[PDB]
Amino acid sequence: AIEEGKLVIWINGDKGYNGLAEVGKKFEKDTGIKVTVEHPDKLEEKFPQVAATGDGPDIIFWAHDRFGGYAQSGLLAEITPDKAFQDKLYPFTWDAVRYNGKLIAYPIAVEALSLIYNKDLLPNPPKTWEEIPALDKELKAKGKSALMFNLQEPYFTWPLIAADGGYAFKYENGKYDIKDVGVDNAGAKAGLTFLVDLIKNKHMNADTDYSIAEAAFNKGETAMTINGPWAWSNIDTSKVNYGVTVLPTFKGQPSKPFVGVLSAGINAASPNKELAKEFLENYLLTDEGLEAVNKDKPLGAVALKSYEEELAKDPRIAATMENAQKGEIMPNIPQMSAFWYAVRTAVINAASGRQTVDEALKDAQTRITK
Numbered sequence: 001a002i003e004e005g006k007l008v009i010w011i012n013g014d015k016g017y018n019g020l021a022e023v024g025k026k027f028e029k030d031t032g033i034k035v036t037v038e039h040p041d042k043l044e045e046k047f048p049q050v051a052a053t054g055d056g057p058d059i060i061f062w063a064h065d066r067f068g069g070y071a072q073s074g075l076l077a078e079i080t081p082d083k084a085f086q087d088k089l090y091p092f093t094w095d096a097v098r099y100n101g102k103l104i105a106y107p108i109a110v111e112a113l114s115l116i117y118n119k120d121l122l123p124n125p126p127k128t129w130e131e132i133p134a135l136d137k138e139l140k141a142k143g144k145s146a147l148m149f150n151l152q153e154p155y156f157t158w159p160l161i162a163a164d165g166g167y168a169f170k171y172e173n174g175k176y177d178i179k180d181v182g183v184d185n186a187g188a189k190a191g192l193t194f195l196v197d198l199i200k201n202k203h204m205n206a207d208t209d210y211s212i213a214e215a216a217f218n219k220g221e222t223a224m225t226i227n228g229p230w231a232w233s234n235i236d237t238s239k240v241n242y243g244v245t246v247l248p249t250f251k252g253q254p255s256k257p258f259v260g261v262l263s264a265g266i267n268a269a270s271p272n273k274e275l276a277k278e279f280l281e282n283y284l285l286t287d288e289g290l291e292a293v294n295k296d297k298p299l300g301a302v303a304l305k306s307y308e309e310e311l312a313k314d315p316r317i318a319a320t321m322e323n324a325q326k327g328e329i330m331p332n333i334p335q336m337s338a339f340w341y342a343v344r345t346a347v348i349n350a351a352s353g354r355q356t357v358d359e360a361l362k363d364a365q366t367r368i369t370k
């Protein structure tokens with residue numbers, strides 16, 4: 001078990017863990033059970049680690065893509081929503097946490113990346129990735145950069161790579177084929193090449209990451225950046241008249257961001273497993289509870305139909321939904337970790353020049369389907 005009579009929660013640092021802490025606080029002056037909320041480093045990598053020993057958090061939040069893996073090694077318990085509840089959330093989010101029929105996590109929020117442009121440096125956001133190299137040239141002259149986003153995490157380059165054809169796993173009649181992977185097809189390379197050419201022509205550095213890119217945009221030094229709803233918080237605080245709109249197309253095709261549903265799974269080795277489901281079911285997954293976390297850091301679109309209704313009013317959320325609808329939701333199968341890993345390298349090694357688009361992407365196709 002390793003817990004006793006308290007509720008521990010694990011959420012990632014760029015999320016509104018402070019707001020989630022408040023739901024706990026309310027849970028506390030209502031249950032007497034201390035809800036502890038932690039955002040450890042690489043919590044996604046440490047959970048399977050400790051949760052093996054029947055430890056870790058009672059609950060774990062993370063995008064659904066990692067939950068099929070978790071369920072596999074048997075580190076997650078079946079959540080028990082009834083036809084009653086499951087009606088409150090969108091179905092397409094329930095599929096997201098479904099692993100072979102069984103549901104292993106609660107869908108809390110739908111997230112996608114969009115183009116965040118500076119309405120001062122760039123009143124008219126570009127429409128094509130192709131427009132970028134030249135919009136950056138007239139800008140880099142006034143000291144300012146056209147764009148800049150996290151190049152260290154593949155997640156931020158997937159919209160370009162999949163735009164003209166790239167994919168992770170193909171969905172063929174009923175399931176994802178672990179053997180058919182599209183990181184090496186003609187479309188994937190076209191995407192990574194444009195990105196490598198952008199850099200190769202000094203339109204961005206192959207070393208930029210989240211901090212660096214967040215600093216540049218929020219400091220007003222870069223006209224646009226690529227990021228999710230969670231990032232708006234710090235921008236608001238910087239003031240920066242910003243915009244959130246559709247990602248630029250490539251080869252005439254829309255950027256296709258891998259869509260993730262922020263889910264909350266309960267450690268299988270949790271002793272206070274009913275408290276967790278009660279905390280999640282009626283407390284967090286309530287307009288109130290979800291409002292608390294959204295005022296700390298935006299969740300984006302959410303599972304709860306009642307609250308996504310007071311949200312969809314926001315141009316940012318309509319934009320989040322557009323890139324979302326324009327892309328694909330990621331699988332939850334265990335192979336997503338191998339997919340994600342293999343691609344992180346392919347994308348970095350190619351950025352540095354430590355490898356060619358071709359060399360890198362065929363090496364990743366090899367690792368994933370290895």
Ligand SMILES: O=C[C@H](O)[C@@H](O)[C@H](O[C@H]1O[C@H](CO)[C@@H](O[C@H]2O[C@H](CO)[C@@H](O[C@H]3O[C@H](CO)[C@@H](O)[C@H](O)[C@H]3O)[C@H](O)[C@H]2O)[C@H](O)[C@H]1O)[C@H](O)CO
Nearest residue numbers: 012014015044061062063065153154155260262340341344
């Ligand atoms: O639930 C909330 C979520 O955890 C976020 O707080 C957090 O922030 C966002 O950005 C991520 C990318 O920076 C998104 O993660 C997805 O993509 C990454 C890869 O880019 C996946 O991570 C996997 O691959 C990396 C290798 O680069 C490896 O280190 C990880 O161990 C492996 O899990 C995620 O699984 C995807 O969900 C995220 O959706 C988004 O909210 C992320 O946790 C950031 O790491």
